[PDB]
């Protein structure tokens, strides 16, 4: 199911999918 | 990159592997 | 060592009080029941002369019915402290049912109910019954069988609960060692004693009623050698023969066999022809042989004990509609467990709390003679509503004639009915499609299934993302083992859908397949077993779980359990009913609330004013003169697809004055969590203030570390209350007010006003009103009013007046209104020179 | 020459792109859709002059000009249109050059360029030019430039090439102007001021010497011969002339589904005209052999809606296999609206229907045209030609008076437990054998209808008493609780009293009444329901006042108890009760005298308002604290499981033991004039119900009135001498409003003004003045003003203030004053405000007099 | 003849007979 | 069997002749 | 008349698997 | 699953249902 955030959503649902992270 | 994610799949809709896509 | 019974045993048969009050005789002097007690349709109870303190216990069940004028059974039984159950009817022991005066209950003395349960029903103005704790006076897990409905409640207090008997008598509780035991709420006593003890004036103690039984009224585990046990009491054989039990509406006598006082011989025993003894059957196994017919009841299927052929062409109808029904297998086991063929067809039909057919222990054959339904069908099952397994593990029962019917099971699932296939005589590969209904059966019961696990892998304030750990296998590829689920059939596994709802409770049962039970949020299937969660609100409990989802072909199921998690706390909202009042001309008042949700543990308010700039005089505003469509896009889309204000870095504690260090130009302070009003002080007069509470919440060690990553921000935004503390008075006063008279010789006075300008005013002088008053009476005090740049910068005006005494008066007029008009100043005018004098 | 292409369908892989290459004609229509980037397209395409039908342009992105793809483009055709339009042009963000700049005639339909938020330049064209005049109400572009610019872009030549057109300019971009051709021109044509010869469509091409050719030519083309009508032989399509044979190769694309050209009338046509059908030979059109036409499909399962689609338009399914509807999708009431857009138009299924599994099914209806089974090769070894299992929630098969003859095999019906048994022996009559019954094996007796409602009787209901926001329904059926007497006219009658748990009422609000009972589906919950009611009188409560309800009952019993009844639906009103307070009453002075009231009533009326009621009180004067004096300023189920668990229990029971202010009272038409006859102290009148405005007249100059407004509703006859209209209730609630009228002029001048000296000795002047007291003030008087200014330049007149507490002991107050001609006049201050000032009066003030000449 | 059930039997015995309802060990 | 109200009347439909057998005291 | 996702999916409801339908 | 999708909210959702496109028409 399409996933839809903007902003600091974003960042807190890549930091979601990521728990190895992300490259900023 | 918070780039890529502002700059695509935050005007559009990102599926799961999308996302996990940008995980590293 | 050993202790007697209290007082001595009188015992009494199993007594009918019926119709007449007189018939209550019957319980004089009666100390125990020997079996039930039976009371009911004595039309009017209010004749009753005497209270029975002598019935302390009855062996098996109380029943009290239809009977009316009778207020309390206290009224009959003082001292009934213990309904032993070694019968039950129907399973209940004790039935208080339509007594439609039994306004109290009043077994104050009650201790335990040793078996079964309790019914209480239709006391239209039975009280209280709802209040006693049933459930601690019964036995250790028959706590589903305590039924109380359609009784009135005129619609220690221990633990928050008044668990008492009516108005007076509160019911004891007993400690965790002692329960249904204790004499009082502090005092245990004798594990032999059963229903409590009594203690002597002297500190001898005494059972109530023996755990086991008596001899010569004292309480011992077991019978004395030579003696057999009869419920209450040993006995001697010469006494059981005699001794009798009512049951299926007959008589038996007592058989003093092996150790007890049996009214049947045991498994494998019949009786001797003088009845005085049990022997082995012929072969040693007995061929009872009974007629089918409709078991309505636990108590009817008591009818059947012993029987071991089912014979006659009536179906034997198993149709036991008890509710959860924690008796209902025990009974029948009771009733049929014994039973080792059925010569007609077996049906069971709508059935309620019958749980499972494992109660025919013994079942091996349904032969049918006469099937039943047209002939057609030899095990019909029908409409059971909590049915949901069949016979016993590795039990076979073979059937000769006829098919199965099997409908409308909810909770008896197809791989069950299926089982039965290696059973009829034609071991067919599969029913009819007229015989198993596919959706009827099962459709609420945990079919083939097996487990999911899932592990929650993270958790954001606004997203989690949860991954399926255990595995799944499709086909059999390197022939795998231990795959713990498999799918046979690369198609069939659609995927993994995962549920969720907002669910504080974390209790919420499972969607069910009803139609508008849509509590639950749900996915669509996810093939890998990993789905991140989107748009949940932050520290909010929220319940998951997954199934797999396979086409109609695949009857393999899998769920996971219900699992719960909370959010992250995220960002705090905006404060609520912000309002600023001024007190005092440096002072504001504050209020707030915090009513909309802290998403999280607020740890501190920041509260900040910032001055703002005094207004200014407009040159548009007269000084003196105004003083103070879609259906294209639709069709397009079809057409085509064919289908194939700042931010919390500047919030901390700090403090600005003004230059002249006179007042803040910034304020701001951090305040504890409980402080919802804050006063302001030393503020500047009559000038706007912004002001703004933010709320701040916990900061978490991986929020905190996360947020070094996307700059997050922990407190609520602004919604800035601007507003002007109140107006300093004095302040425009206009002062070092100094009037004179130039001496230039014009023929009426050229009167000379000088002040000078307010040393801080409220906000801008908009223009100085000068007055004066001729201080004879006939006079008034008359205005002048002039531009404040216009005297600012002069420094001195001139008015010209005739002779006489002026009072003088100069006031600011500033954006804040008039200012206090000066002390009064003089002029004495005097007339200009007439030269014929 | 003139190759073609038939129709286009671009996508975003753009080597599909490719598919327009050397083919100046599409044959049909050009779709480009979703390229995510085009810029990869090196290409162009100038060699595609002209489109057949129509184009759309939807969501490419990575595009940025039309001439980038097919920059030739002259003629769009419009031998179709898109929804009226033949050029659509949507949503194409990176869009920016609408580069058609050759195009000319749109010949049919209109043109949408919308939503391509970067293209600029958009009514820059006039696009009326380019069609047809018919059409010139077909031009449509909006959301073409949300934020880009605020009038930022300019056109050739012109300041912020070609002349002034339009008092503006003609502009494809900032580069290009839009081309003319003459007034006796019609866009075929391709230089502003020498049009091609008239037998050309678009535009025509001269050759290195002279000679002219088209680029399309209208009528028709064959061999590139511009040509008015094909010969015999040829047949037309949209532009070219084909042969015979060739029409069959031909295809055009609708309804997302193929169609073949078939040669008839001398035309290539899609579709045999209404009342024929396509040959068998695929190559001509024939009468319908029935005088109708049935489009013939093949049978196959039908698991989702998205396949029930493919029969949308089907009359006749055939096949050797059944036609198995077999939803288990549990989708709800969607369920019927695609399965009867796919379904509703078979006559006859050849070859056996089967309704396996299905969930959301709630009744065959959606076979809305379905007559005939026939059955030709039936289920399960020939024997069952309608067969029907294990649907959950069926209950209803075939329409009513809807008939379906069933010509070879039974039917087989199990596990439907909604699907009443005495609704399937309707299909009885309608079997070819005629059956008199259906087995125990084709019919399942236990196996169908074992929780539908069966047998319903009928109950009567009746709306015993109302209020204005409660009822009362009494259940009138001799509905009989345990066994009858044999000569009752028992209706029905539960075999065991506690077997029937009660009535339970269903109430709605409905205006219309049009409503119908509740389905099962729990997300039908449009009714109130009630707990069961044993009684059968249930008291209806807090309902709307005069609100249309609809209400209906059903006997709510255990499970196993077969006897229930329903009632219809049916229809009450409650009362009209208290009509809602009138709303937006302002009051505004007019003058000393009158005032309008506005009002409207938004707020609901219950019933018909039949007045509004205006009420005025004159509040009295106001007065004011003169001891905080102010001369220095005047101035203005469980049902079911704890049931049956009892009914057992009791019967197990009974086998053991027997062994043998102002009310609206007053709301009355008034004039109450004060004593004087002047003006009202109360005014009220029992407008229309039509009026909103109200003029006052004759009010007191400068005082509050109170007003209400009342809006009113006709009492109802039980009212009106039932309750002896004591409750009363008739009209409205009100608010005081208020208004303070205004100052009448001059009302406080001073009158009888009049000066004297006094004569007694005296050496500084004793100036008496006198006046009467203003006879009719703006209220009472604070202050009298005097003015007086002897009558020279120079001189300041003074004032004086003095209270009225003094005048009237004073009779006359006294001034001091010496040699001099005074002016003095006066004025009376109201707390209403100062007065204005008499006339002027003078004064002789003579010397101080002396005696030493 | 007579059909009555739970209550409605309750009702027809205790109605339709005298004081004497007698049953066991009668 | 057969041995109580709920069986000879109610589903047995007993006559009144029946019914009065449990009464008779 | 058209089958499409406009009225499978925006005159009422759908699942995400009818979507998938339109994917090439 | 409640997808309601319309218009643009709709086209968003077919290409979050797919990372290939979509459009085959006569091919």
Known sequence: NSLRACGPALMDMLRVACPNGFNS | ?24 | PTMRLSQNVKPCKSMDIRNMVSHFNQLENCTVIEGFLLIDLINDASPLNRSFPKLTEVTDYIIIYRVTGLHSLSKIFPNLSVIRGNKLFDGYALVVYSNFDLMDLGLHKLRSITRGGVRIEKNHKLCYDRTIDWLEILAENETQLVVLTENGKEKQLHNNRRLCWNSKLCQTKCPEKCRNNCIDEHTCCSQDCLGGCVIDKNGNESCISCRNVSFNNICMDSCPKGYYQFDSRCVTANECITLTKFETNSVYSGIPYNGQCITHCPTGYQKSENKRMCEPCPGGKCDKECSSGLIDSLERAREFHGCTIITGTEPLTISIKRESGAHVMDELKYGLAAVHKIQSSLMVHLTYGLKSLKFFQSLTEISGDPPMDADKYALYVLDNRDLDELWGPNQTVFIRKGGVFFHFNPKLCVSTINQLLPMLASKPKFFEKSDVGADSNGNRGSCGTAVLNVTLQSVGANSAMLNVTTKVEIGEPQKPSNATIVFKDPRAFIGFVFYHMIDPYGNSTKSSDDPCDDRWKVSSPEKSGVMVLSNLIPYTNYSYYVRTMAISSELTNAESDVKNFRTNPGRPSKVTEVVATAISDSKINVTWSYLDKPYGVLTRYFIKAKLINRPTRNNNRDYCTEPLGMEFENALQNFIFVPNKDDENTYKDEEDLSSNKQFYEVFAKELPPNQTHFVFEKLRHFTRYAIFVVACREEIPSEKLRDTSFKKSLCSDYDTVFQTTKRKKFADIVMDLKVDLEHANNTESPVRVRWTPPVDPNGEIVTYEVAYKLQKPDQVEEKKCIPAADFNQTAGYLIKLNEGLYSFRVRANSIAGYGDFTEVEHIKVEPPPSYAK
């Open chain 2, 1 to 24: 990159d918070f780039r890529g994610v502002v700059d695509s799949c935050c005007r559009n809709s990102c599926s799961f592997s999308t996302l996990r896509a940008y995980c590293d």
